[PDB]
C-alpha cells in the first residue's frame, strides 16, 4: 500500500504473525480473568515506510525482502476487529532507527523512516463500548503506545511539524509574577531563594529570560544535580556539625589514597591495575596485536527509581545505558568492561504464589507494580548490557515491603518507588586518566543518535546499539594513544546538552559559542529548550582540536557513529547558543551567572530511634522458618536475574553468578581477567542491608560495607587497600528520623569504620527522595523506604584462577563458621523476622573492627595459601541459608552440629551477623585454625561438621536433631520463585522443565569427555615457521564480540584483521586477500528486522560486496566461520555459498527469552574441517543469544539436513544424550542442532562461542587438570593447519 503522505508518500506492508500460540493463550485467558467473552485473536506486524523519494520495481522488491523476518508462525486470514497498535504519535521507536540504518545500509536512501506496529483482530461479538476499551487496554502499553482503529491512521506518526521559536518569561513586564507563573507553568521547582536570584540576575542584564535559559538552570539546580543535601551544613541534636555528607565521604580518601588515580573530578573513580596485554587493532595495519602497558580501572554505580517506579524496561535500560557512556567518558576516553545490577521492589505477590507475610497496602494508580517493575525492568537492564556488549556478573533482589513499629512509629515501609542500580568496571590507559587542558578555538562535539523530545516525561527511551557505536569511536581513540584526538569527555545525562555542555567548556576554564540548528535532530518541531534540555540518550560531548577533526570524522564514519560539532571553545567565559533559523540567541548568559550558586543548604534535624520489640516466636518453628525464608525473594535463587543477561561477552569473565556443573547461582562476587593474556584481573561485589536501618542507621550501613568485605574474601586481592568503595545512597530526606539517620550512617563508614578499615570511597551516588504518597480511600496513604545504602567493592586481582565458590566438595573435609558476630545472635530486622511479619529487637552490627579486619586478612592468607576448598558468607537468612546454598552449589549433603553457637537454635541459624563458612581439607583443620587464631579469631571460629556425598541436611545439637531435611527438597523450594517468575515472564513450558529438573538428584552436572589431547597445540609447526595467515575478522555495527575471535585465531598463529562492512563498501579492504573469514558474534542493528538479518542484506543489496563474498566462498581453498550473530548473518547468505542449499533459520527462542548458559553440546560427525579430530567429544560452551532456535521449513528439509550430515555440534543434556528438553537445550532447537556445515565442509557456522571460552579460565566450571587451553581452541589451531 502506497498513500499520500505530507510532503512524502507512505508505504503500509503487511508483516508476519505476531504472537506465538502460548501468547495467544496467555491474551484469551487474560480476558476471560475480567469477564471479557473473547472468542478468538490474532496478531501481525504491520510495517510502515515514510518515502521521500519512489522505489522502482528491484527497490521495492528489496524492501520487502528486508521487512520478511521472524519465526515461521501460524498465519490465518484477519477476521473481527482491528485494533492497531503503534508507537504514541510524537515518539520514534528504537526499532523505527535500527531499522531504518538497515534500510539505508542497503541503498535505500528514499526511506525516510521505518516504523512498525502490531495489528491484532479480535473476534468478539458481545463487547459493548467500555469492553472494548477494556480489550484495547490489555492489548498496549498507555505510557508508550496508542491504539489506532485503522491502518491508515499510522499517517499520524510521521507528522512533521515546524520549529517552535523560543518563548520569553515577561520579567521586566509582569515583575516576579512571571517567574511565579513560570515556575509553575514549565515544572522548575525553584526554591524562592532562586527565583530571587534569578530574577536579581535578569534585571542585572536588563533583559527577560528565555524559557530555555530558566529551564537549564532549574535542572542544573535540582536536588538530582547539585546535591544540596550532600553539600549541606548540619546541625543534630542542637550541635552543629563540622562536615557536609561529602565532606565525610572524602575523608575516606584523605585517609587513604592509596592506590587511587582519581576521585571526585570525574564521572568515574580510577584505580590503579595491572600491566597486561590489551588487545586491539592497530590504526595504520588493522591488525589485532597485545600492547603490554597498564590497564587501570574505572568504577562507577549510578540509580534509575524515578524512571523505572513509571516505565520499568526503558528506566532499567537507560539506567545501565547512562552508566556505561560515564564509564566510556572518564578521562580522555575509556572502555567498559563488566557490570552490576541491583534491584529492591515490595512485595511481589505473585498471582497464586502469596506468600504469608505479604500484604496488598495499595499503591499509586500512575506507578506499576513490584512485580511488574521485576517482570519489565530486569529484561530492559539485560536488554541494553546484551545489546551493547558488556557482561552482568553480580547483584542484588531485595524485595521489602511491611507495616513495621520503626523510628517515626508504626508506618509502611517498602520500595514502591524502586532502587534500580546499575554500575560496572572499565580499563582505562595511564596517560587518558587526567582531563586534558580545552584550548580555545576547540571543537564541541556531540556524539551519538539525533534529539527527540524524551527530557510521560518519565518514559525513557534505549536504543543499546548507537551506544555500542559510540563506544568503538571512543575506542578508536584511546588506542591512538599519545595521538587520542579527545581532549574532554563528558556523559550527556539529566539537562541534556543544557547540562553537559556548560559543565564540559566550565570544566576546562571556557566559554563556548553554539549553533542550535548544527545539533543533530530527529523531530524538526523542537523548541530551543526542548532540543537544548531533552534527555535523549546514547550522547556524548567531546572537545576536539580544530586540526584533528578529520581524523575524528574518518574514525565515526568507519564506525557509523553520529556526530556533529556544534560549536567552539572561547577564552571569554559565556555561553552563547544561536539560532540560524530564527536568526536569534536563544542563549546569551556569562557562565558565573548560569552556573552561580544560591546560599549553601542548613539542615536542622533531631535523632529519632525506634524502641525494637522482642521476637514474637509463637508461630515459629525451625522447620517452617527454613521453609519461609527460602521462599523470601531476598533469599530465594536469581535464576531469572542472571540468565537473561550475557555473562561471556569479552572472553575474560573468570566468575560469574553460575557456580560448579549444576550452575547454581550463588557465587559471592564477579571477577574479570584484567586481559586475554593474563591470570591478573578485577573483582566485584555488593553488600546492602536496608531493613536493618528501620532500627539502626549506622548498624545498616556497617552491616552493608561488612557485606562487601565478606562477599569480596574468597578472591586473591592481598592488601585491603586495594578496595574501592562505590557508596550509593537511597533515602526519603524531609522523612522524620530519616536527615539524622542518614548523617549518621554517613558519619558510621566515612569518619569511623571505613577509614579503621582502609577502605577508600573515591565514588558514590545519592536518591533523596524514596518515598511515594497516595489516596487509597479517603485517607492519605505513604510508603518510605528505609535508609539504604548500597556499597559496591572493586579491586584489582592478584590470581583470577585462585577464587574460591561456594561448591562444596565431599572429599575429607571440615565446615568451620567464622561468626564475626560474637555470639551476639542477633535477629532484629533479618529474613526470619520479615518472614513473620515481625522487625525484631536489634540487628546485626560489625561488633569488632579489628576482627573484621583480621578476618580479611586471615581469609586472603588462606586463599593465596591454597588451603580452602570453599567459602560462602552469611548474610539473608543466615547460616541455614550459607549451608544450604553451599549444600546446592556442590550437589552434596551437610552434617553439621550447633551447640556451641547457643542454646537458642533459631538464633543461632537465623541471625545474620557477619562472617561465613569455609571448607577446607580435613587434614588442615588445624593449621587453618591456628592461623585464625593469628589473626585474634580463636572465639569466633567453630568447627561445625562436614559435606558428605548425599542428599541429607542435617543440623544437631548434641544429641538432639535440631532440623533436618532432603537438600533436593530444599534446592526446589528455594528455587520456586524464580521457577515461577519464568512461569510468568517466559514460556511456562520452557520454566517448568527448567524447575523440574532441579528435583532430580541424579542430574551429574556438567561433565567432559574429549576425543584428543586438550594440550596438543597441532598449529605450534606452523607458528614455529613465523609465517602466519591473515584471517578478516567480520564485524557490522552492533557486533560486539570480535576482539576476542581475534585473540582466539591469533592464539592459532593467524595476523587477525579487523574488518568492518565499511571497509568493505569503501574498498580498504578485500577479500581476495584472505584465505579465511570470520563472521563475529554480536546484535547487527539490534537483531532488528531478524537477528542477522541486515547484516546479510546489505551484504546481498551492494552488488559490488554481494560479489566479493560470493567470489571468496567459491574459491577451492578457503575456510569460514560464522558464530552467533554471525551464524544467522552467513544462514541468510545461503545463495552465495556452495553446499548450503539445506541449511535452516535460525529464529527467536522456544522459551522466548534470551538465553546466557554454559551448555553442554556433543561434537558429531560431519564434513567440517574446523571439527576435525573433535567428533564424539562432549564439553561445555558459552551460549548467549535469543534466536539461536534452528527452523526448517518443514519436516522434508530437516531429515534431509540430517541425511546429508551437514550437523556438527548438538546440545545434550547432563546425562549425555541430544535434546530438545531446556535448558539443557536452551533454545529448542530440532535434535540439538546448533552447528552445521556446508558440502565441502569448508564453512562451518554455529550459535554458542567457542571464542569466548577458548581460555580455561574463562570456563564458568571446568576440570580442575586443564592447563591454559580449554577444548575449544582447537578449532582455531584447526583452522591454521588446515590452511597449512
Ligand atoms: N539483580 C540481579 N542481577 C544479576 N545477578 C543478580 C541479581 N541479584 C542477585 N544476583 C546474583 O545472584 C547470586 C545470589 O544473590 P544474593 O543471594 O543476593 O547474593 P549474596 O547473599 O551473596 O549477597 C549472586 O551471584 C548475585 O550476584
Ligand atoms: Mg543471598
Ligand atoms: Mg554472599
Ligand atoms: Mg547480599
Same mark, same amino acid.
Given at each position: 500500500?502506497?498513500?499520500?503522505?505530507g510532503?512524502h508518500?507512505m508505504?503500509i506492508?503487511r508483516?508476519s504473525?505476531?504472537?506465538?500460540?502460548?501468547?495467544?493463550?496467555?491474551?484469551?485467558a487474560?480476558?476471560?480473568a475480567?469477564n471479557?467473552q473473547?472468542?478468538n485473536?490474532? *496478531?501481525?506486524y504491520?510495517?510502515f515506510a515514510?518515502?521521500?523519494?519512489?522505489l522502482?520495481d528491484?527497490?521495492?522488491?528489496?524492501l520487502t525482502?528486508?521487512?520478511?523476518?521472524?519465526?515461521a508462525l501460524?498465519?490465518?486470514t484477519?477476521?473481527?476487529?482491528?485494533?492497531?497498535?503503534?508507537?504514541?504519535p510524537?515518539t520514534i521507536?528504537?526499532?523505527?532507527?535500527?531499522?531504518?540504518?538497515?534500510?539505508?545500509?542497503?541503498?535505500?536512501?528514499?526511506?525516510?523512516?521505518?516504523?512498525?506496529?502490531?495489528a491484532?483482530?479480535?473476534?468478539?461479538?458481545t463487547?459493548?463500548a467500555?469492553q =472494548?476499551?477494556?480489550?484495547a487496554?490489555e492489548?498496549?502499553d498507555?505510557?508508550?503506545?496508542?491504539?489506532?482503529s485503522?491502518?491508515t491512521?499510522?499517517?499520524?506518526?510521521?507528522?512533521?511539524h515546524?520549529?517552535?521559536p523560543?518563548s520569553?518569561v515577561?520579567?521586566?513586564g509582569?515583575?516576579?509574577?512571571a517567574?511565579?507563573?513560570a515556575?509553575l507553568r514549565?515544572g522548575? *521547582?525553584?526554591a524562592?531563594?532562586?527565583?530571587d536570584?534569578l530574577q536579581?540576575?535578569?534585571?542585572?542584564?536588563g533583559?527577560?529570560?528565555?524559557?530555555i535559559?530558566?529551564?537549564?538552570?532549574?535542572?542544573?539546580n535540582?536536588?538530582?544535580?547539585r546535591?544540596?543535601?550532600?553539600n549541606?551544613?548540619?546541625?543534630?541534636?542542637?550541635k552543629?556539625?563540622?562536615?557536609?555528607?561529602?565532606?565525610?565521604i572524602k575523608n575516606?580518601?584523605?585517609?587513604?589514597? /592509596?592506590?587511587?588515580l582519581?576521585?571526585?573530578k570525574?564521572?568515574?573513580a580510577?584505580?590503579?591495575?595491572?600491566?597486561?596485554?590489551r588487545?586491539?587493532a592497530?590504526?595504520n595495519?588493522?591488525?589485532?596485536?597485545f600492547?603490554?602497558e597498564?590497564?587501570?580501572?574505572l568504577m562507577?554505580?549510578?540509580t534509575?527509581?524515578?524512571?523505572?517506579?513509571?516505565?520499568?524496561?526503558?528506566?532499567?535500560?537507560?539506567?545501565?545505558?547512562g552508566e556505561?557512556?560515564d564509564?566510556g567518558?572518564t578521562?580522555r576516553?575509556?572502555?567498559?568492561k563488566?557490570?552490576?545490577?541491583?534491584?529492591?521492589?515490595?512485595?511481589?505477590r505473585?498471582?497464586?504464589?502469596?506468600?504469608?507475610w505479604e500484604e496488598?497496602?495499595?499503591?499509586?494508580?500512575?506507578?506499576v507494580?513490584?512485580?511488574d517493575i521485576?517482570?519489565?525492568?530486569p529484561?530492559?537492564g539485560?536488554?541494553?548490557?546484551?545489546?551493547?556488549g558488556?557482561?552482568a556478573?553480580t547483584?542484588?533482589?531485595?524485595?521489602? +515491603?511491611?507495616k513495621?513499629?520503626?523510628?517515626?512509629?508504626?508506618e509502611? !515501609?517498602?520500595?514502591?518507588?524502586?532502587i534500580?542500580?546499575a554500575?560496572?568496571?572499565?580499563?582505562?590507559?595511564?596517560?587518558?586518566?587526567q582531563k586534558?587542558?580545552?584550548?580555545?578555538?576547540?571543537?564541541?562535539?556531540?556524539?551519538?543518535?539525533?534529539?527527540?523530545?524524551?527530557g510521560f516525561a518519565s518514559?525513557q527511551?534505549?536504543?543499546?546499539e548507537?551506544?555500542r557505536?559510540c563506544?568503538?569511536?571512543?575506542?578508536?581513540?584511546?588506542q591512538?594513544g599519545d595521538?587520542?584526538?579527545?581532549?574532554?569527555?563528558?556523559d550527556?545525562?539529566?539537562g541534556?546538552?543544557?547540562n553537559?555542555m556548560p559543565?564540559?567548556?566550565?570544566?576546562?576554564?571556557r $566559554?563556548?559559542?553554539f549553533?542550535?540548528? /548544527?545539533?543533530?535532530?530527529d523531530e524538526?518541531?523542537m523548541?530551543?529548550?526542548?532540543?537544548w534540555?531533552?534527555?535523549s540518550?546514547?550522547?556524548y560531548?567531546?572537545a576536539?582540536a580544530?586540526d584533528?577533526?578529520?581524523?575524528?570524522?574518518?574514525?565515526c &564514519?568507519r564506525?557509523?557513529?553520529?556526530?556533529?560539532?556544534?560549536?567552539?571553545a572561547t577564552?571569554?567565559?559565556h555561553?552563547?547558543?544561536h539560532?540560524?533559523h530564527?536568526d536569534?540567541?536563544?542563549?546569551?548568559?556569562?557562565?558565573?551567572?548560569?552556573?552561580?550558586?544560591?546560599?549553601?543548604?542548613?539542615?536542622?534535624?533531631?535523632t529519632?530511634k525506634?524502641?525494637?520489640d522482642?521476637?514474637?516466636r509463637?508461630?515459629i518453628?525451625?522447620?517452617?522458618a527454613?521453609?519461609?525464608?527460602?521462599?523470601?525473594?531476598?533469599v530465594?535463587?536469581?535464576?531469572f536475574?542472571?540468565?537473561?543477561?550475557?555473562?561471556?561477552?569479552?572472553?575474560?569473565?573468570?566468575?560469574?553468578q553460575?557456580?560448579?556443573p =549444576?550452575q547454581?547461582?550463588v557465587?559471592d562476587?564477579?571477577?574479570?581477567?584484567?586481559?586475554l593474556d593474563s591470570?591478573?584481573?578485577?573483582?566485584?561485589?555488593?553488600?546492602?542491608r536496608?531493613?536493618?536501618?528501620l532500627?539502626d542507621?549506622?548498624?545498616?550501613?556497617?552491616? *552493608?560495607?561488612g557485606?562487601?568485605?565478606?562477599?569480596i574474601?574468597?578472591?586473591?586481592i592481598?592488601?585491603?587497600? !586495594?578496595? &574501592?568503595?562505590?557508596?550509593?545512597?537511597?533515602? #526519603?530526606?524531609g522523612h522524620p528520623?530519616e536527615?539524622?539517620?542518614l548523617?549518621?550512617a554517613?558519619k558510621?563508614?566515612?569518619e569511623?569504620?571505613?577509614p579503621?578499615?582502609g577502605?577508600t570511597?573515591?565514588?558514590?551516588?545519592?536518591?533523596?527522595?524514596? &518515598?511515594?504518597? =497516595?489516596?487509597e480511600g479517603?485517607?492519605?496513604?505513604?510508603?518510605?523506604?528505609?535508609?539504604?545504602?548500597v556499597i559496591?567493592?572493586f579491586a584489582?586481582?592478584?590470581?583470577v584462577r585462585?577464587?574460591?565458590?561456594?561448591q562444596?566438595?565431599?572429599?575429607?573435609?571440615?565446615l568451620?563458621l567464622?561468626?564475626?558476630?560474637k555470639?551476639?545472635?542477633?535477629?532484629?530486622?533479618?529474613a526470619?523476622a520479615?518472614?513473620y511479619?515481625?522487625?525484631?529487637?536489634?540487628?546485626?552490627?560489625?561488633?569488632?573492627?579489628?576482627?573484621?579486619?583480621g578476618?580479611?586478612?586471615?581469609?586472603?592468607?588462606?586463599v593465596?595459601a591454597?588451603?580452602?576448598?570453599?567459602?560462602?558468607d552469611?548474610?539473608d537468612?543466615?547460616?541455614?541459608?550459607?549451608?544450604a546454598?553451599?549444600?546446592?552449589?556442590?550437589?552434596?549433603?551437610?552434617?553439621?552440629?550447633?551447640a556451641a553457637?547457643?542454646?537458642?537454635?533459631?538464633?543461632?541459624?537465623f541471625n545474620?551477623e557477619?562472617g561465613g563458612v569455609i571448607?577446607?581439607?580435613?587434614?588442615?583443620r588445624?593449621?587453618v585454625?591456628?592461623?585464625?587464631?593469628?589473626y585474634?579469631?580463636?572465639?569466633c571460629?567453630?568447627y561445625?561438621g562436614?559435606?558428605?556425598?548425599?542428599?541429607?541436611?542435617?543440623?544437631?545439637?548434641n544429641?538432639?536433631?535440631?532440623?533436618?531435611?532432603?537438600?533436593?527438597?530444599?534446592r526446589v523450594?528455594?528455587?520456586?520463585?524464580? =521457577?515461577?517468575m519464568?512461569?510468568?515472564?517466559?514460556?511456562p513450558?520452557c520454566?517448568?522443565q527448567e524447575?523440574?529438573?532441579?528435583a532430580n538428584?541424579?542430574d551429574?552436572?556438567?561433565?567432559?569427555?574429549?576425543?584428543?589431547?586438550i594440550?596438543?597445540?597441532?598449529a605450534?609447526?606452523?607458528?614455529?615457521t $613465523? #609465517?602466519?595467515?591473515?584471517?578478516?575478522?567480520?564485524?557490522?555495527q552492533?557486533?560486539?564480540?570480535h576482539?576476542?575471535?581475534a585473540?582466539?585465531?591469533?592464539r592459532?598463529?593467524?595476523?587477525?584483521?579487523?574488518?568492518?562492512?565499511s571497509?568493505?563498501?569503501?574498498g580498504?579492504?578485500?577479500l581476495?586477500?584472505?584465505?579465511?573469514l570470520?563472521?563475529?558474534?554480536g546484535?547487527?542493528?539490534?537483531?532488528?528486522l531478524?537477528?542477522?538479518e541486515?547484516?546479510?542484506?546489505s551484504?546481498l543489496?551492494?552488488?559490488?560486496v554481494?560479489?566479493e563474498?560470493?567470489?571468496?566462498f567459491h !574459491?577451492?581453498?578457503?575456510l569460514?566461520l560464522?558464530?552467533?550473530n554471525?551464524?544467522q548473518m552467513?544462514?541468510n547468505?545461503?545463495?552465495?555459498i556452495?553446499?548450503?542449499?539445506?541449511?535452516p533459520?535460525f529464529?527467536?527462542?522456544?522459551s522466548?527469552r534470551?538465553? *546466557?548458559?554454559?551448555?553442554?553440546?556433543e561434537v558429531?560427525?560431519?564434513?567440517?574441517?574446523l571439527?576435525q579430530?573433535?567428533?564424539?567429544?562432549?564439553?561445555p560452551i558459552?551460549?548467549?543469544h535469543?534466536?539461536?532456535?534452528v527452523?526448517?521449513?518443514?519436516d522434508?528439509?530437516?531429515?534431509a539436513? +540430517?541425511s546429508?550430515?551437514?550437523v556438527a555440534?548438538?546440545?545434550?543434556?547432563?546425562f549425555?544424550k541430544?535434546? +530438545?528438553?531446556?535448558?539443557a537445550?536452551?533454545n529448542?532447537?530440532?535434535?540439538?542442532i546448533t552447528?552445521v556445515?556446508?558440502?565441502?565442509?569448508?564453512?562451518?557456522?554455529?550459535?554458542?562461542?567457542?571464542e569466548?571460552?577458548?581460555?580455561?579460565?574463562?570456563?564458568?566450571?571446568?576440570?580442575?587438570?586443564?592447563?591454559?587451553?580449554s577444548?575449544?581452541? !582447537?578449532?582455531?589451531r584447526?583452522?591454521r &593447519?588446515?590452511?597449512?
Amino acid at each position: 500500500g502506497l498513500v499520500p503522505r505530507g510532503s512524502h508518500m507512505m508505504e503500509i506492508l503487511r508483516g508476519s504473525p505476531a504472537l506465538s500460540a502460548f501468547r495467544i493463550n496467555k491474551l484469551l485467558a487474560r480476558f476471560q480473568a475480567a469477564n471479557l467473552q473473547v472468542h478468538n485473536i490474532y *496478531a501481525e506486524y504491520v510495517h510502515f515506510a515514510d518515502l521521500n523519494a519512489p522505489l522502482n520495481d528491484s527497490e521495492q522488491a528489496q524492501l520487502t525482502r528486508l521487512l520478511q523476518y521472524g519465526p515461521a508462525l501460524s498465519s490465518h486470514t484477519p477476521a473481527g476487529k482491528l485494533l492497531l497498535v503503534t508507537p504514541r504519535p510524537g515518539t520514534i521507536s528504537p526499532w523505527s532507527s535500527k531499522a531504518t540504518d538497515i534500510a539505508h545500509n542497503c541503498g535505500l536512501q528514499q526511506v525516510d523512516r521505518l516504523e512498525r506496529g502490531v495489528a491484532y483482530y479480535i473476534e468478539a461479538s458481545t463487547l459493548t463500548a467500555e469492553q =472494548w476499551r477494556q480489550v484495547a487496554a490489555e492489548l498496549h502499553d498507555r505510557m508508550m503506545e496508542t491504539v489506532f482503529s485503522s491502518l491508515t491512521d499510522a499517517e499520524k506518526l510521521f507528522i512533521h511539524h515546524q520549529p517552535a521559536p523560543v518563548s520569553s518569561v515577561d520579567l521586566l513586564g509582569e515583575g516576579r509574577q512571571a517567574l511565579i507563573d513560570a515556575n509553575l507553568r514549565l515544572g522548575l *521547582a525553584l526554591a524562592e531563594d532562586e527565583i530571587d536570584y534569578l530574577q536579581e540576575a535578569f534585571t542585572k542584564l536588563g533583559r527577560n529570560p528565555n524559557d530555555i535559559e530558566l529551564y537549564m538552570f532549574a535542572q542544573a539546580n535540582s536536588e538530582h544535580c547539585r546535591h544540596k543535601i550532600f553539600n549541606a551544613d548540619w546541625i543534630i541534636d542542637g550541635k552543629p556539625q563540622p562536615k557536609s555528607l561529602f565532606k565525610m565521604i572524602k575523608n575516606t580518601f584523605e585517609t587513604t589514597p /592509596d592506590y587511587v588515580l582519581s576521585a571526585y573530578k570525574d564521572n568515574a573513580a580510577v584505580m590503579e591495575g595491572s600491566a597486561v596485554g590489551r588487545y586491539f587493532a592497530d590504526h595504520n595495519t588493522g591488525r589485532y596485536d597485545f600492547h603490554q602497558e597498564p590497564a587501570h580501572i574505572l568504577m562507577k554505580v549510578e540509580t534509575h527509581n524515578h524512571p523505572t517506579a513509571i516505565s520499568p524496561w526503558p528506566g532499567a535500560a537507560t539506567g545501565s545505558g547512562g552508566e556505561i557512556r560515564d564509564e566510556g567518558a572518564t578521562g580522555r576516553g575509556a572502555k567498559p568492561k563488566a557490570g552490576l545490577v541491583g534491584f529492591s521492589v515490595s512485595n511481589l505477590r505473585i498471582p497464586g504464589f502469596e506468600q504469608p507475610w505479604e500484604e496488598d497496602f495499595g499503591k499509586p494508580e500512575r506507578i506499576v507494580t513490584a512485580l511488574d517493575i521485576m517482570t519489565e525492568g530486569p529484561l530492559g537492564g539485560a536488554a541494553f548490557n546484551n545489546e551493547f556488549g558488556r557482561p552482568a556478573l553480580t547483584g542484588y533482589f531485595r524485595t521489602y +515491603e511491611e507495616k513495621v513499629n520503626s523510628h517515626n512509629g508504626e508506618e509502611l !515501609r517498602g520500595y514502591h518507588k524502586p532502587i534500580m542500580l546499575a554500575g560496572g568496571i572499565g580499563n582505562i590507559r595511564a596517560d587518558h586518566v587526567q582531563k586534558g587542558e580545552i584550548v580555545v578555538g576547540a571543537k564541541l562535539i556531540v556524539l551519538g543518535g539525533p534529539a527527540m523530545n524524551i527530557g510521560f516525561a518519565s518514559v525513557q527511551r534505549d536504543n543499546p546499539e548507537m551506544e555500542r557505536r559510540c563506544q568503538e569511536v571512543i575506542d578508536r581513540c584511546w588506542q591512538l594513544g599519545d595521538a587520542n584526538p579527545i581532549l574532554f569527555i563528558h556523559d550527556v545525562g539529566a539537562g541534556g546538552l543544557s547540562n553537559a555542555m556548560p559543565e564540559l567548556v566550565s570544566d576546562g576554564g571556557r $566559554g563556548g559559542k553554539f549553533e542550535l540548528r /548544527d545539533i543533530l535532530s530527529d523531530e524538526p518541531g523542537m523548541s530551543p529548550l526542548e532540543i537544548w534540555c531533552n534527555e535523549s540518550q546514547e550522547r556524548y560531548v567531546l572537545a576536539v582540536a580544530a586540526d584533528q577533526l578529520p581524523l575524528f570524522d574518518e574514525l565515526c &564514519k568507519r564506525e557509523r557513529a553520529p556526530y556533529a560539532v556544534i560549536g567552539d571553545a572561547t577564552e571569554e567565559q559565556h555561553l552563547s547558543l544561536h539560532d540560524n533559523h530564527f536568526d536569534n540567541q536563544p542563549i546569551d548568559l556569562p557562565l558565573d551567572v548560569l552556573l552561580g550558586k544560591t546560599p549553601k543548604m542548613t539542615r536542622d534535624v533531631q535523632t529519632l530511634k525506634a524502641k525494637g520489640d522482642a521476637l514474637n516466636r509463637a508461630d515459629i518453628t525451625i522447620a517452617d522458618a527454613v521453609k519461609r525464608v527460602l521462599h523470601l525473594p531476598t533469599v530465594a535463587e536469581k535464576t531469572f536475574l542472571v540468565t537473561i543477561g550475557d555473562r561471556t561477552v569479552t572472553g575474560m569473565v573468570a566468575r560469574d553468578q553460575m557456580v560448579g556443573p =549444576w550452575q547454581v547461582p550463588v557465587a559471592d562476587c564477579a571477577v574479570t581477567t584484567a586481559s586475554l593474556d593474563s591470570y591478573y584481573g578485577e573483582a566485584m561485589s555488593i553488600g546492602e542491608r536496608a531493613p536493618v536501618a528501620l532500627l539502626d542507621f549506622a548498624a545498616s550501613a556497617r552491616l *552493608a560495607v561488612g557485606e562487601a568485605l565478606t562477599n569480596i574474601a574468597a578472591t586473591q586481592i592481598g592488601d585491603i587497600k !586495594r578496595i &574501592k568503595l562505590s557508596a550509593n545512597w537511597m533515602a #526519603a530526606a524531609g522523612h522524620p528520623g530519616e536527615d539524622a539517620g542518614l548523617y549518621d550512617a554517613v558519619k558510621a563508614v566515612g569518619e569511623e569504620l571505613c577509614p579503621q578499615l582502609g577502605l577508600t570511597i573515591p565514588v558514590g551516588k545519592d536518591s533523596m527522595s524514596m &518515598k511515594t504518597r =497516595w489516596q487509597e480511600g479517603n485517607e492519605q496513604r505513604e510508603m518510605t523506604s528505609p535508609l539504604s545504602l548500597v556499597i559496591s567493592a572493586f579491586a584489582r586481582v592478584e590470581d583470577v584462577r585462585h577464587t574460591l565458590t561456594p561448591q562444596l566438595s565431599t572429599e575429607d573435609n571440615a565446615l568451620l563458621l567464622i561468626d564475626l558476630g560474637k555470639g551476639h545472635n542477633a535477629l532484629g530486622a533479618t529474613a526470619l523476622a520479615q518472614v513473620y511479619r515481625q522487625l525484631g529487637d536489634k540487628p546485626a552490627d560489625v561488633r569488632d573492627v579489628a576482627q573484621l579486619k583480621g578476618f580479611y586478612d586471615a581469609m586472603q592468607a588462606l586463599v593465596a595459601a591454597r588451603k580452602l576448598l570453599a567459602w560462602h558468607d552469611r548474610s539473608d537468612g543466615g547460616l541455614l541459608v550459607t549451608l544450604a546454598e553451599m549444600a546446592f552449589a556442590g550437589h552434596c549433603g551437610v552434617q553439621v552440629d550447633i551447640a556451641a553457637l547457643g542454646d537458642d537454635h533459631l538464633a543461632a541459624l537465623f541471625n545474620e551477623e557477619l562472617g561465613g563458612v569455609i571448607q577446607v581439607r580435613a587434614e588442615d583443620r588445624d593449621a587453618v585454625e591456628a592461623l585464625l587464631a593469628q589473626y585474634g579469631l580463636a572465639d569466633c571460629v567453630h568447627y561445625l561438621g562436614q559435606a558428605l556425598a548425599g542428599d541429607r541436611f542435617v543440623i544437631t545439637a548434641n544429641d538432639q536433631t535440631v532440623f533436618s531435611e532432603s537438600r533436593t527438597t530444599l534446592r526446589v523450594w528455594w528455587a520456586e520463585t524464580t =521457577w515461577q517468575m519464568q512461569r510468568l515472564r517466559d514460556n511456562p513450558q520452557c520454566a517448568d522443565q527448567e524447575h523440574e529438573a532441579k528435583a532430580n538428584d541424579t542430574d551429574p552436572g556438567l561433565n567432559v569427555k574429549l576425543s584428543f589431547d586438550i594440550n596438543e597445540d597441532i598449529a605450534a609447526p606452523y607458528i614455529a615457521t $613465523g #609465517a602466519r595467515p591473515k584471517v578478516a575478522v567480520l564485524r557490522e555495527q552492533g557486533v560486539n564480540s570480535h576482539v576476542e575471535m581475534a585473540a582466539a585465531f591469533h592464539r592459532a598463529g593467524f595476523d587477525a584483521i579487523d574488518v568492518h562492512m565499511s571497509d568493505l563498501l569503501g574498498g580498504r579492504i578485500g577479500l581476495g586477500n584472505f584465505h579465511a573469514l570470520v563472521a563475529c558474534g554480536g546484535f547487527s542493528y539490534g537483531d532488528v528486522l531478524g537477528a542477522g538479518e541486515g547484516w546479510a542484506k546489505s551484504i546481498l543489496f551492494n552488488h559490488r560486496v554481494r560479489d566479493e563474498f560470493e567470489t571468496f566462498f567459491h !574459491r577451492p581453498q578457503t575456510l569460514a566461520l560464522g558464530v552467533c550473530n554471525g551464524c544467522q548473518m552467513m544462514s541468510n547468505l545461503r545463495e552465495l555459498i556452495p553446499g548450503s542449499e539445506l541449511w535452516p533459520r535460525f529464529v527467536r527462542n522456544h522459551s522466548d527469552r534470551f538465553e *546466557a548458559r554454559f551448555s553442554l553440546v556433543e561434537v558429531t560427525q560431519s564434513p567440517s574441517l574446523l571439527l576435525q579430530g573433535m567428533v564424539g567429544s562432549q564439553m561445555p560452551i558459552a551460549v548467549s543469544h535469543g534466536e539461536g532456535r534452528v527452523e526448517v521449513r518443514d519436516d522434508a528439509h530437516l531429515a534431509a539436513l +540430517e541425511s546429508k550430515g551437514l550437523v556438527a555440534l548438538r546440545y545434550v543434556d547432563n546425562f549425555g544424550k541430544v535434546t +530438545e528438553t531446556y535448558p539443557a537445550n536452551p533454545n529448542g532447537s530440532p535434535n540439538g542442532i546448533t552447528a552445521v556445515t556446508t558440502e565441502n565442509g569448508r564453512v562451518t557456522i554455529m550459535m554458542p562461542h567457542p571464542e569466548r571460552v577458548f581460555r580455561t579460565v574463562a570456563n564458568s566450571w571446568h576440570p580442575e587438570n586443564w592447563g591454559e587451553d580449554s577444548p575449544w581452541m !582447537r578449532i582455531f589451531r584447526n583452522a591454521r &593447519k588446515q590452511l597449512g
